[PDB]
């Protein structure tokens, strides 16, 4: 009939446990179940990613041990909240994160278990601060081959999801697949204090410690002067007949700014004695 | 027994979510949960942890409740799915400890014979690093009391691990990377001068506590001795550094030589391309 | 002639405006530098294979022996030349 | 005919002082985005390297 | 000034008369002999486009309408201007009592039309009871709203100069984009005010690609074509009542009331009680949308209380998109109002839920409630600036875009440029560069010379807003 533009909120303990779990079992792929809260149609949230046990032979739907389901989920029920699962997670550390055969083998099992039953695809060897490696999907059924494919009532924020046309093999796998919007939403209870942790533990740690210094003199004079003579070679070759010469390259780089930061921070290091001492 | 810790922020967020789990219900005092750990050297590491329910009435601070069955069950879970980890202690969210905490400590020092707590703050503004470490050993006393079982403040830090900041620095988004050359030094100046000499002035407020009060452990053992480590510089008037003005000139020496030479070469950097391209643009603009 | 001359000395401030147009030129400078450096993930794009073309065949199709490997009938793009096979 | 003149050009002048103050901080903030771009360049070579030779 | 009188020069005298910024010799320039009211009347134009504060620009205005009441011809361009700037409810009643004395028919016509299409929606509809509690019948004729939009409808049906070949060259589109609703966006926009229905009748499946906006746009483009069309709405949409259609889900019945709101845009009859009952007798919130939008649109200044009562407790926490409709409806009925009831009940409400639609719609609503304020909200605007990432800073940008409409205030531009480039969230940057067209429409020739530098940003956000700003 009509379907409102969906969203997958995260809690980022989710993403941290994803990277840590795919780091712990890093030469191997893993499988897991995603926990969260079914809020509405146009949004859904993952609030908790919990550990799921290993297989060794094959990652399968039978990695979902139902006695472990009972134990794990009930001991989360007597932990803080009995919230509801919102899907499932896995890894593919061996390649560029597209949908394996096991995923479509368990997709009907999970959409029998869940309403959306959204996948989570990850590669744990990517970057250190930048990449958003996680990938999520929704297999639409082949029974709706008569009707049009992925209506998405507005298809304007879906077009504002459509921005890179990412992962050309998944866009080969556009047969009944599409990625979904995942924002990294705010936690007012957590964001400013994570910022507190981060900044106020990295600005000198206790903020009182270093406010090395006497051999970087020689290191910086080498790193400056040895590049400076080739920085001054090119006015030999500068001339007139404007386009009749072809080698424009700047030379002032890392001898303005490296010397600026170097000498100003080490003259404040020469100021440390008067700052600390009286 | 514990050298220091290497504590990742992930376990702190694993405290934060259970703080969210208790902020919605009747909160009597605080959170007491399990602290797992990866103990390798006398240094310490934590990768993960989980919580345990807890309530506490205040009549004789002895009515306080855990579930060791649930604790060892989920310990068996996370030990099976990860054989690296083991329990290393606990944590609490209220930043000031209380007298029940020794009963908590010694009641969970039976699984592993050490159980280091973690003070945190869910609303931190004034502190430095949230992570704190105590250990329960005895010095017994100078007066040798019957078992003066004391928490002993072990040093601490925020740990570090490769590619655990993938979420973090993408999330926070506001970081001005490499502000060397601008105002980070004076932020450290304001905060270390004011926020360390206020620690000093509250130490002398504790000295006023020793003046008007402070019979208790008045502590003439460690206080003046580490303050004598301070008193390596009794910096009274007349300033006493006639034997250090030439050393300060030696400090000024090399850096000002670098400044003179190098910034003359920096003017020499700017002027060449500035003049040439300047009059290029000027009289070839039309 | 009070403001009959004040407005003239503020017509002189059109030469203050050339400095502003210069500053606008300064901000337009490094705008294409940042639009070039943000577009360096073109250089982060996946590699490619050097091969050996024997000869083409029908229906706009060609043949490649790659570096150690056998023969692979590969497909043609749009911005290339069958007449340069 | 005079009073119309500085009612245009004074407004022009204060609008131009407005943007002349703004563009300075504009060009400032561009260098911070440029330093982020620099770190994005620098992090392309940290843990690996796979030695070949130039052909 | 005696030197001005000796030189006989008038505009140097008025320059010196505004040098004092005071009515002393400004009163004396208009106290002179042979002062031509043409020069003295575009002196009003001069002082209208220049004087910054409302502290004495309107005082200069009203002392000039004083000196035009001193002019021997009974002037009405003076009250025609100060009635819509210095917004006097009693002066229009007193010139109406001058109409009662005068007994003309030119006397009650043109200034009536000037305020009747060029004053506030609240203003004339509020003051009309002051003016009516013959010309007493003629004000009922040409103040009610019974002829102007109807002759405008006549003007647009009999002013039809259009094309259909473009509609054919897009009619032959087949694909499953929602551009098939852009086809009727075209044939509804280029055929407003006609009420000839030549577009609903050329389709069986070209209409039947049932989604939300297939239904809603299909029954909404008819009302876009029915702009005006006061009486015949019910007996022309007898098949298109909310219970007479059987929609896909809710929007062949939602867009019907939306089209009735478009038909009765700013000229309401029973379009308070009728519409508010049929939304009160409406199954859920998923229907009430277009009726609520047109309800707020027609209910400007009607002091509708149920739009304040049942909307917040209709959502109870939030809605799908009709919470956005709720913000829009209370903003339209409370346009530029400083709705101190709803300052509290909107912006001490838009923090404790979590979704994007409900918060963005209350953001647009608290933008809409404050309009043309010029000082009166800006501490609250920076209080919105000190909030979290995507919501209140964005709405503070839209609210300063609405509070500074028509003026070249250099207050908005500070935080505008600041949050336009210094911020890391990018949609709020797009909004912040959108804001200049909102605040700079009176003197529009300022923007392109400086938004051309905004045109070269890192992101398509600021480039996109820079493309929208010149427009
Ligand atoms: Zn797989």
List the main descriptive attributes of the protein structure presented here:
part of a larger assembly, 5 chains, A: 278 residues, alpha+beta, four-stranded mixed β-sheet, 7 helices, 32% helix, C: 85 residues, two-stranded antiparallel sheet, 12% strand, binds zinc ion
Describe this entry's structure for a reader.
This is part of a larger assembly, with chains A (278 residues), B (286 residues), C (85 residues), D (55 residues) and E (471 residues). With 278 residues, chain A is of the alpha+beta class. Chain A has helices at residues 13-24, 66-77, 101-113, 168-172, 191-202, 216-231, 257-276, and strands spanning 8-9, 31-37, 44-49, 84-90. Chain A contains seven helices and four strands, in the order E-H-E-E-H-E-H-H-H-H-H. In chain A, a hairpin with a 6-residue loop joins strand 2 and strand 3 (44-49). Chain B is extended, with a radius of gyration of 27 Å. With 55 residues, chain D is mainly alpha-helical. Helices cover 69% and strands 0% of the residues of chain D. Chain D has one helix spanning 5-42. The N and C termini of chain D lie far apart (76 Å). In chain E, 58% of the residues lie in helices and 0% in strands. Chain E is built from 29 helices and no strands. Chain E has helices spanning 2-7, 11-19, 23-29, 37-48, 57-69, 77-85, 89-102, 110-117, 121-132, 135-144, 148-157, 165-171, 179-189, 212-225, 233-236, 254-263, 273-280, 289-298, 306-309, 312-315, 322-333, 340-347, 357-368, 378-385, 392-403, 412-421, 427-439, 448-454, 460-470. In chain E, helix 7 (89-102) crosses helix 9 (121-132), helix 16 (254-263) runs parallel beside helix 18 and helix 26 (412-421) packs antiparallel against helix 27 (427-439). Chains A and B meet through helix 1, helix 2, helix 5, helix 6 and helix 7 of A and helix 1, strand 4, helix 2, helix 4 and helix 5 of B. Zinc ion (ZN) binds at residues 29, 59, 92, 100, 102-103 of chain A. Chain B: This is 26S proteasome non-ATPase regulatory subunit 7. Chain B: One of its GO terms (cellular component) is proteasome regulatory particle. Chain B: There is a cross-link at residue 176 (Glycyl lysine isopeptide (Lys-Gly) (interchain with G-Cter in ubiquitin)). Chain B: Keywords: Acetylation, Isopeptide bond, Proteasome, Ubl conjugation. Chain B: Belongs to the peptidase M67A family. Chain A: Its EC number is 3.4.19.-.
Topology:
This is part of a larger assembly, with chains A (278 residues), B (286 residues), C (85 residues), D (55 residues) and E (471 residues).
Chain A lengths: L7 E2 L3 H12 L6 E7 L6 E6 L16 H12 L6 E7 L10 H13 L54 H5 L18 H12 L13 H16 L25 H20 L2
Chain B lengths: L4 E3 L1 H15 L8 E6 L6 E3 L3 E2 L16 H14 L4 E7 L8 H8 L24 E5 L12 E5 L13 H5 L11 H29 L10 H8 L14 H39 L3
Parallel strand pairs in B: 1-3
Antiparallel strand pairs in B: 2-4, 2-5, 6-7
Chain D lengths: L4 H38 L13
The structure holds zinc ion.
